[PDB]
Design a protein around this ligand. Structure first.
Ligand SMILES: O=C([O-])C(=O)[O-]
Ligand SMILES: O=C([O-])C(=O)[O-]
Lengths: 291, 291
């Protein structure tokens, strides 16, 4: 049921890597003021990989606290162990998250049936809406449309974040599902098109730095206004490219630092955006009216 | 300095997924008796991803205990968090491991500089011989030959497991290193070839089921006997293929079960080998004289 612009929020950090709680609070308030419809806490963009289990709980807890029921909060709770995904998803439920986002198991390369059993076990263990997340380039595995369609029959499986950026494939998935569960874009470059074709929203990186603009792109695309969607998306299209010059969230964190919103903290093995990309990124932000 | 057939040993499990301690002991003894030169504990093939922190420690401790210093034991200690990799590697040192094997951070896709800093931080934190491990199809990142060569300059980085299966590239890496650190094959299919070209051994999946034969393949290949290497590898070549019909270690665990050495336990999201593959597998094992 969650629709619109759903920001995959960064986890602001101090220079030493510690979570920057004060900056986080201000970012959440800013998203709400600017029109962001929902926040994914501790997803890929929020450096789930380098936060401790305690830090994961704390970030989810703080975002929910600051949000104060104004928008729904989705907790990133994916793991490449089914046992661990259960524990994380249960924790999110207990914290009062509205849903959980669960990337396919990465690195261990389960079969399609293994993916099915993984999500089914989690759905049966935890009464919380669950959103699947497919991003083959990062995980080593591709949850097929066919497996996605099977999983949409499982109670508590309510959607999928499709980060393939393959529009014909995404449309085919939307059409096959016929409303049985939601489809979210996980590719900012093509999100506007997927929403025009029936996606429920965009779980967005670009929304981190252009929340008002992305909230508008999603509103018009969901409303099926093809021309407004093209026009509004065009204004920020360069941002969708430049935020991936190095692996996300490296560029988006630097963008936010240049906007004066967060400090430079980022956890190894990730690194601050390479010096050479900083001027080009400043130029793209200036071009789009962000700074 | 470790050379020869280095088994990436499975972690035997009971039907309910609990670690099968007795069967693990028997395997370790069998490897030593059969001529296996070293064991990698809790690597990819050992389901590192689905074992708890405690179980990782117990499995390493048990393999070291049973091996009783007859062969070196290498502990899988990779993580996609540099902090977590340091903790796991320190624990391995403390348990008495001879070396650690560290897959590149997966999923989060660090930059080449990030990979460099990741491994540099670990080498400086833990005085233990470290073996890099590149398997881009699983991790979403490719540690370049250039970055490997830089890392070979760091004193306790003593080698790399190259699972690309790209022999020209592996040869180039061998040639560029000029002995600065070891190269190990991580691709059974081409391992004989890479060892004839200068690799110090094969961190092997096939060795789980044909330890004697792989020990002999490694020995003659390292001795640069091309004719014997081909001859001996041919006897087990179909195994290198069939053990990957579904994601490793799915097929290898089933093979060992058919051999009567372990039970069927394997942890979600991994699944027992699909029924359609079981007869072809039994036949390949019968063909190779394994059963
Ligand atoms: O939410 C996530 O997983 C994202 O940021 O891509
Ligand atoms: O230890 C390992 O990396 C393996 O099993 O491939």
């Amino acid at each position: 049921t969650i629709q619109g612009s759903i920001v995959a929020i960064v986890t602001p950090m101090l220079k030493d890597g510690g979570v920057d709680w004060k900056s986080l609070e201000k970012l959440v308030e800013w998203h709400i003021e600017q029109g962001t419809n929902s926040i994914v806490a501790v997803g890929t963009t929020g450096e789930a990989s380098t936060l401790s289990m305690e830090e994961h709980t704390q970030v989810i807890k703080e975002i929910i606290r600051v949000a104060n029921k104004r928008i729904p909060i989705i907790a990133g709770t994916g793991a490449n162990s089914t046992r661990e995904a259960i524990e994380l998803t249960k924790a999110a439920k207990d914290l009062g998250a509205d849903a959980a986002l669960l990337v396919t198991p990465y690195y261990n390369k389960p079969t399609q049936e293994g993916l099915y059993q993984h999500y089914k076990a989690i759905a049966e263990a935890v009464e919380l809406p669950l959103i699947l997340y497919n991003v083959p380039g990062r995980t080593g595995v591709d949850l097929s449309n066919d497996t996605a369609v099977r999983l949409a029959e499982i109670p508590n499986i309510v959607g999928i974040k499709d980060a393939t950026g393959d529009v014909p494939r995404g449309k085919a998935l939307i059409d096959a599902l016929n409303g049985k569960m939601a489809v979210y874009s996980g590719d900012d470059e093509t999100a506007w098109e997927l929403m025009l074709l029936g996606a429920d929203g965009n779980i967005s990186v670009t929304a981190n730095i252009a929340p008002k603009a992305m909230s508008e792109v999603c509103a018009v695309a969901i409303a099926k206004d093809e021309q407004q969607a093209k026009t509004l998306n065009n204004k920020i299209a360069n941002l969708h490219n430049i935020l991936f010059c190095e692996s996300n969230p490296i560029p988006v964190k630097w963008a936010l630092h240049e906007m004066g919103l967060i400090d430079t903290g980022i956890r190894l093995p990730l690194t601050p955006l390479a010096e050479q990309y900083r001027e080009p990124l400043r130029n793209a932000l200036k071009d789009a009216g962000i700074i």
